[PDB]
Design a protein around this ligand. Structure first.
Ligand SMILES: [Cl-]
Ligand SMILES: [Cl-]
Ligand code: NA
Ligand code: NA
Ligand code: NA
Length: 132
């Protein structure tokens, strides 16, 4: 599997959880194990993202909540749950693996295309991730 496919697997997982939150951190981590299949071949790289997600979901969800709002501009001189799941994965991944900002954003937009969301305009906030 490609790193992109592995990212998609985390996104879909997170997505399925956002309908029924909150769950305890170790519960989500154990739910991720039951989520594994022949095709997913879930590895430690993905499990570390889900671990960061499980332990920081309250803060990530807050940071998101407030960045959207803080986007209230004049000049320059309703986020959905799939788009949220994509953004939380990027936050989770930068936390677990310290992936650089440019790679995370391109990848995120690539996943949005995969789900034919075409709401790419809500970048992975150039505001929410750190450029190293
Ligand atoms: Cl895939
Ligand atoms: Cl999948
Ligand atoms: Na790989
Ligand atoms: Na995990
Ligand atoms: Na953590």
């Amino acid at each position: 599997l490609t790193r992109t496919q592995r990212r998609i697997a985390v996104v879909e997982f997170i997505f399925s959880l956002l309908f029924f939150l909150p769950k305890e951190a170790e519960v989500i981590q154990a739910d991720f194990l039951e989520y594994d299949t022949k095709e997913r071949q879930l590895n430690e790289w993905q499990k570390l993202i889900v671990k960061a997600f499980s332990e920081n979901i309250f803060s990530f969800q807050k940071k998101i909540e407030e960045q959207q709002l803080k986007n209230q501009l004049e000049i320059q001189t309703k986020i959905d749950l799939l788009t949220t799941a994509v953004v939380l994965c990027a936050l989770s991944e930068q936390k677990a693996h310290n992936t650089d900002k440019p790679l995370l954003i391109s990848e995120a937009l690539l996943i949005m295309d995969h789900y034919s969301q075409g709401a790419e305009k809500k970048q992975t906030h150039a505001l929410l991730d750190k450029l190293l």
